[PDB]
Structures are given as structure tokens and as C-alpha cells.
Amino acid sequence: MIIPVRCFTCGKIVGNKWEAYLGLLQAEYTEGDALDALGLKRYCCRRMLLAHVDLIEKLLNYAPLE
């Protein structure tokens, strides 16, 4: 739905890296290079950014009921 705050396994902070991850990908980085640049060494943390599907961007297409 949205990027999780913590890494599920180790508890490292990941929610403050989704926008940076996408920005690095727009800079033509391989995904491994992007995750290395963000400093996620353990594959538990890398799994979350590598496998996250951001559906909130799609949910924001619908107008709010206010």
C-alpha cells in the first residue's frame, strides 16, 4: 500500500528511502546499485525496497469523499 516504516525482520528504518530509491532509479542506477547507495547491506532490508509495490499512488487517483 505504502512503504513500511521499519524493516520487518531487523527493524531498520526503510520508510525514509522509497522516494530516494525511485530518484536513484530515475538516475539510471541498477537496483542493486541503488540499494547499495542507500546503505541496505542485509538482504532482509534490500528485499523490502526491491519488492515493494506502491499502491497509494494509484489510490490517490480517486477523488476524496471529503
- Which residues sit in the known binding site? 7, 10, 44-45
Considering only 18, 29, 36, 44, the residue that binds Zn ion (CB under 5 A) is: 44
Distance CA 3, CA 54 (A): 7
Query: Whose CA is closest to 45, among 14, 16, 20, 23?
Result: 14
Distance CA 35, CA 30 (A): 9
- Binding residues vs other proteins (CB under 8 A): 1-7, 9-13, 15-20, 42, 44, 56-57, 59-60, 62-66
Which amino acid appears at position 7 of this protein? C
Q: Closer CB to Zn ion, residue 24 or residue 45?
A: 45
Binding residues for Zn(2+): 7, 10, 44-45
Asked whether position 45 contacts Zn ion by CB under 5 A, the answer is yes
